[PDB]
Write a protein that binds this ligand. Structure first.
Ligand SMILES: [Zn+2]
Ligand SMILES: [Zn+2]
Ligand SMILES: [Zn+2]
Ligand SMILES: [Zn+2]
Ligand SMILES: [Zn+2]
Ligand SMILES: [Zn+2]
Lengths: 267, 256, 249, 267, 256, 249
């Protein structure tokens, strides 16, 4: 599995160094350093999102360009860390205006349709297109929860939360008060949340068939980048989420599917 | 503890702030206002934020970032100062009433669409227009409980302000959960909920305006009716997976 | 169950020994395509099964639903021996050329578990959803992994551990990483006008589609569905049809 | 590993059936059923210990006779269960005078000495000889502790305890009060305990060498079967127990060794 | 609860047991003895075990196997009966004293070497000879605790009899463990520990005699001196890995 | 550490290529005995090592303690290739025929880590006890198994997990089933009368014995111990001798 190989510490460090070298040393057709200008424009307008084109990444690193579409989570995390390091080197004071630099992947060679997604595409970086039909408001979501212990008043460390399950607390050093654990509102870190709904294009839908739809999740800078009735090109991680209600309804164990959005382009 | 030091600093701010120059004269501004309001029957004051910064910049900086505990300490300090200024009260009014502190500032207002998730539990200043309101219900502040079997009483329990409850004890100290709230031994205050709509000009093109739920308490109730333009200063707080509703505890209103 | 084992061995021999006029194995060329991804279901003619062994064909028709998993296991071994493929890759058998046409009214409780063939007009379809075939259940008291827990049209979990220590009541977490997912679709068909008897409404039924046989038949298309009849859950029970092959005439 | 093979459910059932058949059908040189008489004598005097000779077990079941010296714990547990079933069949009312029938192994072909025991003998049924030097009194030891839950007043099930570690509680059904767990003295089950100390024989010790010694643990019927200054033949499971005090003393990580006694014969 | 029913049955046993035949006459045995002892100043009674079996076999069978709770219920019943028999007490003696119940039986005595581990928390009868004793110390029965910071008081806490303590609370209901025992608000009873040695004839050949620790309380103290042959009736209980010391709570002594 | 790898390869080549006058491999016959149980240590003459490669012999003498584990690993592969042997079985090297005799007084901090040879009279011995060479440590927060955790003359545990999630402070349980145990003995020897200088007491030292070299030398026997010198644990430190071979003259 590519996930196991990229999970290796030495492989992780090698990928980190390769991405740092790619960011620092990538000349253009005229020799200009593209990422210097990109980071300058990003920090000049107080953004926290850095776009990366897949074509030049493949041109300068084919191994990583092959690893990415198969393990899009850890690879993107390493890319984010390397980008943050490079930005901090270039702009030492940017730790005030931002706390995490995100990497957005553009021009992914593979393009699919909402009607041809099967279990083969699970946990893979896919690229689809469609028309937005629904857009909920921006709600806050728990990013890193800081559980406390009533037995000792000491507060446990951060616990990352995913969009697929409910995070549970760990173990206190010596007084094992697993039960009496709560959440404080002044140290927990939150993040923006928005769940859009995309459907097939009016022109591209088969006459005999009916339009299909899939749910997408937008977080952090991605929120409020779409409005209902807009044609978009969505790149994200196809993700599988259990839904017992559908199981009971259909009478057969079935799971819901959602897309964790990573890059959105409006055409 | 540091809480006592903070309370003492707030008391010193209330007792020692003066306005004017020696060419005309000096008048204590908040002590006189506290005395006048307490004698009139209105138990509230309106404390500016530039004055507190000028007296003590650290104290102002601890109110723009951790409003809950510092505002509670400020209210307790105001109660103590008001008690000491009118110490010989007439017969029947020996007990000292609680004082509510409202905040105000001259900062540039923010937008509803600019409220990020980082600015949670921070003082914010957002304009808007009120489009809805609810009936004035009751919110408890002091409660007393009693066991159903052994009728043990645990009185003077305090309930946090805002849309936050109180988890009742399980052990009787008599089956599980034997405690019920005594009806007549409860102190309640006024309580209202509003809906703030984004200003008609800050709304982007081809998009419907957004909304935000507000919370009003005590003397802030029945101050704004639907259809008024207001500027709200309040505490951003929280009331899908891990999704929590977010409201705004209002601590100051400036009707336009 | 020596019946299932004998059927599996005979089916494997049929796959690796069937030869037409050219005297060549067609199923080896079929598995050549099964090597590639996006392919997970094989094809076979029931008439050729009869030609090779009418007794085996009859045995298949007796307990088609019961012996289908073993047929899939045999075709898995055949394809894996033919070419290099991931072990986790599942395979399915599609039975075509079934002359025993039936009637919608003829369906009854006796016919449950036997290969049949029905015709109808497609009324409505449903979107494609993942389906959990075999889930991985883990005890919360000893962390013993119990894999390949089949789901019988319902969320089913055991009450025993893999290791002989715990017997957990209801605490069995499910891991999607070790689980098996197959495409699922739920279509509805009604009785055709020709089949319609006098003074009777069409008895519409529901059809379960899996594997590559998903999004195959559009609405209002006359199709012949080949598959078994099963009971889908005092014990509430209802009838349903699980078609392995869909054909249009 | 023999332990893994004998841990299989089918293997366990097969061994159980073979041992039951051996107990029920084992004629003597004259054809007499030896185990019928043995069980009659055991139940007649109100005992809970049944001796089994290794020679006839090997004669009637070589596979089990080979399995036993390599996995003496689970094999002996299965033997105990089969013996209890046979006794209950023969004497239906013996559940009053006893609650568990023990099997004692006699005439083990392998014989060793206390001076030639190494890590090769760990977790194996060994047979040594020596002279007893110390015998502590009989103290009660926790056999099956029944932990309770203060959150619900319901008491957890039995938890077996070994002579090598301290047993910890499990998990309550829904109210996870791991901390507030205690022990009741009226539903717990105890067992007798006695720790003898054996040393090398005065005559058999090498003149140049000095006598060696090893500790042995006696439980249930075995207690008060030895007195200081007695020559015995000890059969038991050689067992390894950590001892940090010896580690600190020697300055090197070292572990203590004890013998879980199973059969004791006085010569 | 079943505890109330058991207590009522014990009270009925105490109030209704009679000895004699109608040819001579009937005399209540335990009610008269309770009245006489309470008036004399000795707060104890000696209840036989065959009498309780004859009155109610189930009650006797619940004392030979779960002595702790049933003996406590029997003592409470004895206290209530003694209170009702001498209801109009003289001035100053309104409060009713606690009664201690001692048991006796005619069963064949066991041996110290015959005490298995199955017979734990069961009434046993073992003879022996006393070879040691200790000074009469004090054992608490009722204690009252008080917080060090907020001086909250939780009185009338009951401590189980025997060599068993009381785990003090952690939460103050004021740092962790803020509770200390008030010295003067404690009720104590006498307390002694003995050592029983196996009889000189029951000892096997070529072996030293074994010993066993005993526990005596209230009126059982200072009854046996070293060098006396006694027959002890008591509760076998517990005070290496998992090894626990075992003693015998003595509830009756018959000095020979 | 290419030095250790090169030493391992050269030692393996020496084992599989050393041939005397008969032109035959002695170490293959030695490993024939290593196939049997109760055998876990091999023998080798340092003079023959010099004959085969004096440079390799010098390299061994430089860092004997450092390169000894790799020598053991190489002899493990040699023995396992020679005959069927369980993988868990460990093997050790005993070095004999070392002409570089030393003095007890000559021992110093500079000589630590180098192969030496000393003589003395055995004073007292100790009983045989198990010793934990490499322990298995398991995180209590994620249950990740960290095997082959060497013990450096003390109970040593790491603070990191096998998987990259936890970093446990002190919660690392030890499993004896996956652990490695070797025989351990602690004897004491004193300086011989011949070595005794004028007006000086004998400087008695302690010797660590392992593997089959346990219960080898009785009390009051003049023996020559071949082994390295190590430091056994403000940082308290004391000297000790770890003899791999014991010989009597
Ligand atoms: Zn804690
Ligand atoms: Zn109560
Ligand atoms: Zn389990
Ligand atoms: Zn519970
Ligand atoms: Zn307190
Ligand atoms: Zn961990």
């Amino acid at each position: 599995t590519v996930r196991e190989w990229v999970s290796m510490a030495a492989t992780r460090l090698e990928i980190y160094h390769r991405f740092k070298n790619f960011l620092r040393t990538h000349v253009d057709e005229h020799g200009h350093n593209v990422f210097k200008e990109k980071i300058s424009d990003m920090c000049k307008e107080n953004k926290e999102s850095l776009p990366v084109n897949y074509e030049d990444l493949a041109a300068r690193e084919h191994v990583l360009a092959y690893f990415l579409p198969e393990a899009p989570a850890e690879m993107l995390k390493i890319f984010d860390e390397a980008a943050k390091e490079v930005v901090l080197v270039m702009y030492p004071k940017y730790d005030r205006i931002a706390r995490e630099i995100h990497v957005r992947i553009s021009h992914l060679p593979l393009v699919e349709e909402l009607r041809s997604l099967r279990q083969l595409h699970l946990n893979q970086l896919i690229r689809t297109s469609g028309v937005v039909t629904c857009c909920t408001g921006v709600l806050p979501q728990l990013s890193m929860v800081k559980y406390n212990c009533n037995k000792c008043n000491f507060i446990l460390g951060p616990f990352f939360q995913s969009q697929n399950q409910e995070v549970r607390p760990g173990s206190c050093p010596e007084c094992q008060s697993f039960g009496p654990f709560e959440i404080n509102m002044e140290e927990t870190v939150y993040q923006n949340y928005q769940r859009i709904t995309i459907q097939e294009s009016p022109g591209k839908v088969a006459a005999g068939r009916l339009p299909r739809s899939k749910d997408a999740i937008l977080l952090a800078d991605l929120v409020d980048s779409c409005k209902p009735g807009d044609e978009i090109e969505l790149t994200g991680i196809y993700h599988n989420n259990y839904d017992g209600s559908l199981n009971t309804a259909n009478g057969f164990p079935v799971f819901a599917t959602v897309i964790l959005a990573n890059h959105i382009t409006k055409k | 503890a540091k809480k006592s030091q903070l309370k003492k600093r707030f008391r010193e701010f209330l007792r020692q702030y003066r306005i004017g120059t020696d060419r005309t004269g000096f008048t204590f501004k908040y002590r006189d206002e506290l005395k006048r309001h307490y004698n009139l029957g209105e138990y509230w004051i309106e404390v500016e934020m530039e004055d507190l910064a000028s007296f003590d910049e650290d104290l102002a900086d601890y109110l723009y970032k951790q409003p809950t505990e510092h505002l509670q300490l400020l209210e307790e300090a105001a109660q103590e100062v008001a008690d000491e200024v009118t110490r010989p009260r007439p017969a029947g009014e020996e007990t000292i009433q609680e004082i509510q502190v409202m905040l105000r500032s001259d900062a540039n207002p923010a937008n509803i669409r600019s409220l990020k998730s980082e600015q949670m539990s921070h003082l914010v200043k957002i304009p808007g227009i009120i489009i809805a309101a609810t009936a004035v219900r009751a919110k408890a502040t002091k409660i007393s409980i009693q066991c159903r079997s052994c009728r043990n009483t645990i009185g003077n329990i305090a309930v946090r302000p805002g849309l936050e409850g109180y988890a009742m004890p399980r052990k009787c100290n008599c089956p599980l959960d034997p405690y019920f709230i005594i009806p007549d031994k409860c102190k309640c205050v006024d309580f209202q909920t509003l809906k703030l709509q984004e200003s008609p000009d800050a709304v982007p093109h081809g998009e419907l305006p957004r909304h935000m739920q507000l919370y009003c308490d005590r003397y802030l109730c029945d101050k704004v009716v639907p259809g008024n333009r207001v500027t709200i200063m309040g505490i951003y707080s929280i009331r899908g997976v891990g999704i929590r509703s977010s409201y705004i505890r209002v601590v100051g209103i400036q009707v336009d | 169950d020596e019946l299932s084992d004998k059927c599996q061995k005979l089916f494997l021999e049929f796959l690796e020994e069937c030869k037409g006029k050219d005297g060549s194995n067609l199923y080896v060329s079929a598995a050549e395509e099964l090597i590639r991804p996006e392919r997970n279901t094989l094809a076979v003619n029931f008439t050729d099964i009869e030609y090779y062994n009418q007794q085996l064909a009859t045995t298949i028709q007796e307990e088609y639903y019961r012996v289908y998993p073993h047929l899939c296991r045999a075709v898995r071994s055949f394809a894996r021996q033919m070419g290099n493929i991931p072990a986790n890759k599942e395979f399915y058998i599609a039975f075509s050329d079934f002359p025993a046409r039936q009637k919608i009214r003829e369906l009854s409780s006796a016919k449950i578990g036997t290969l049949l063939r029905i015709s109808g007009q497609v009324v409505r379809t449903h979107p494609v959803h993942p389906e959990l075939v075999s889930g991985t259940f883990l005890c919360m008291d000893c962390q013993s992994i119990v894999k390949d827990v089949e789901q019988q049209f319902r969320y089913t979990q055991p009450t025993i551990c893999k290791n002989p220590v715990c017997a957990n009541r209801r605490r069995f977490t499910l891991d999607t990483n070790k689980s098996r997912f197959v495409d699922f679709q739920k279509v509805r068909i009604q009785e055709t006008q020709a089949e319609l008897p006098r003074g009777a409404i069409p008895r519409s039924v529901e059809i379960i589609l899996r594997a590559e046989a998903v999004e195959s038949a559009m609405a209002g298309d006359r199709c012949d569905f080949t598959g078994t009849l099963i009971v889908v859950p005092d014990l509430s029970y209802r009838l349903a049809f699980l078609a392995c092959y869909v054909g249009a005439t």
